Amino acid sequence: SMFLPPPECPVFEPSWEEFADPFAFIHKIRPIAEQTGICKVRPPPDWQPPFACDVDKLHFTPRIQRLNELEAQTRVKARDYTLRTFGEMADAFKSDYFNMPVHMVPTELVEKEFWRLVSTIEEDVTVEYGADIASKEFGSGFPVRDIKLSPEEEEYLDSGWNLNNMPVMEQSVLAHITADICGMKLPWLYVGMCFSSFCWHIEDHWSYSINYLHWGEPKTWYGVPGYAAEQLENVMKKLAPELFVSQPDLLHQLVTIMNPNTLMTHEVPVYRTNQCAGEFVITFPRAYHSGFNQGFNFAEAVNFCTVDWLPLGRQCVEHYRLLHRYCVFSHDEMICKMASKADVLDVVVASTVQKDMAIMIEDEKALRETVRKLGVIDSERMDFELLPDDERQCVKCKTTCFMSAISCSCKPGLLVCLHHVKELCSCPPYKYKLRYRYTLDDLYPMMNALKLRAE
Template identity: 30%
Template structure:
């Protein structure tokens, strides 16, 4: 999924674009919640619709998606199996580097479990001894379960007996250390001596007190290592070849009897993967870390090819410029209009999520193992929120309309179904598309190594949804990937825009321009005297000359308000009351700050690209353009009727 969408602002999606968000969720009041029994009966889930378009129907993706939309939106997702002739290339290379995300499966549902509790105690003791435990110790690219290693050694008689009898082979098998990992016995010995021997030499009473401190700290909502309260964090940079090797090792750990490669799970039932995954997620007894990667294909050139011989309309790099998608006027936006390449391994997950802008998006599986998707349609949001608030109250923002952050939680679909949430499920195979409809919630998990690609699109009917979503994001102080004002402005100045599209844009763009003009007038009335019109080349710099959050769709650090985090397009205000970098505000919050603190007025400077006359002219020109085009269309229709 285009996870760069959120990570673009927070680093998430995005990409996501290709880092996990570093913004921490506000601390919630912890409630004691019991874990309901986990059901493996998938019959309570609805099968998402599957479509098999013929060659003719497969000519125009947006047209076909609009055709099937009425049937699909009530499911949230659908799967499309292309005609057999559709066999696009996938451009990847073993040397392709990207920053991987570390996904901690045992923290996906609830952050705290028996394993996490013991690991925090071990980490706490290591900190007291000034022993660095980051990065986490790995063997074969897989993080070692330190609490599991401690217990395995204790079960075999303790460290003295294991060291004396050299029982590391039994320890390795207990921990499911990949048999093909180089020097796995000596590495286990080294890891134990460095990270666990100090903990093992403590008395039972000392270890008990350590655990009590961990429990007390959790109750106070205080965490020494914030990463330990997240289920997905930024990992290390690696080439695709290394990622594949780790994927192969991970697969062999959990399915050692499967005699095929990590790229082929044709004989492995996806339900078998689901059962193993959800056990790990809900029991939280073992430390399990897998990886995923999200790569901006616009910069790397990977994924779908983009050349004259690969112009199939369902090529996602072509689809993004389809004349049925109004996003084409926006230009390249990482993780939105520029496809994102996703690499996954066994148990790689996409947490429950929906696009913050309410955009529909499409995912194509280039190669690899199956991916299991779950979908909740937009109409089920209230029921889903009630279920989430009951099952994982600490991980949802119950007091906000934007209540679910990305990369936050995986709740078993059967548990949600038990709470009366209507879910659909589908298994995406190599060479197939999955479409996510506007404002739908989705999650997914991978059955092995795979490479997929996704991109957003937007038919003109999305505009009222988008307008509502952008207002919601602003009220909730949530970031956006692009400015709605910029999209509307771009559509209005795009010669390719049809009269029908312009008619839908006008009633949203005009009030926005009217508000902009009024805000500028109010700021002048309150005494703001420093105004500067910027050229296109100047708009990418702050007044102190430093580049910062440019109002450019091709930059990953768009200018945003420091209060509401809205992407700024028409103008921005900077407050230079501090000696360090200026604070950036949208005009709404600049006016609010001036009203609350009149003294800041003298420090405020307003920068804009289009003056009021140009804004008014755009409104008038657009209105005249619509009238002229409509008249021509009406005249042409009348002539056709008389003939």
């Protein structure tokens, strides 16, 4: 037997009452789902968002994909397809590949065959797909405000499970952040075809993700719990070390296709599911996942960050620093933005932010004491949030600075974070300046505002 399917991941069928609040529901299932990394959610029977589109007016630029196990690919990027011409190409591909009608090809068989073809470099199957944020050429699958909407479209505008709303809801910790992240708060649209595949990965900053399949043939998933992320990476490192070489930026991270049986052989727990149209898949923090499409389909996905995630978010940026990997945003900047809005925060959010802020302040206090002992004496307040992100990365570890950094007039524009004072230039430390966003005396009242809000 060449492929043994992993065990099924948890499937939840919440009542209307349980379903109404996505954040409460996710918190409820967390003790179960965090052990499997992914889970599937079937909405109540009458939660049925309307899907309507003109398949001739939606168009997109396709990406192309070779399907070889262990071969390097990248997450970020030909004549356009319309949704109709992509669909015709996709249906004909599958139909011809199997010499069968597409909805007569068993899901078990497509899966078995996927793992055969990626392992056999004699086969050079290539497929195409779409992947992008919503645009005027190809918009969200959920209702958004703008056009006169139907009554049914209007009902789902404000849904918690409308993925456009998820990040700006009250229990989301990104609800009041000002920085423009196209990646972390905007949904991505994915147009799939048979065998088009997403390589093993975790989300930026170890966030959650929620993924909805609007219509079409199923999407097959493999997931690994967060506690096993480093085991998985060690397996990857032994079998494909090329994927771990340092890359110039975040538009360059390498990822790959790998058979889940190979992971399971090395004691990594893996779970599977077939996500059908109308179902959600949720991925938990640091939970590795991968998969492929059974045929022509359309999915929508978004990152999100709950209060549960906050401490993991801090750990992630620490992990990025040790690896010299670029950040998408400054975690500390997000924390201080929320503290500056303490009076309008949800009170549980306020309570959790306060705890992370206390850790941030004590770490910052110790770091500033250490660089003072290195002989850095001069200092000046600096509004880091005003710099383009690529103008405030630590020269050494690439972390996005916000709380503080060291500069030297010798190297105009260059910064190091306070872990890397010795990595900036050859000048003696008294030539350096500590650039800081806030004094410790600024920070304690900000934290107290959170405590008062949390009561």
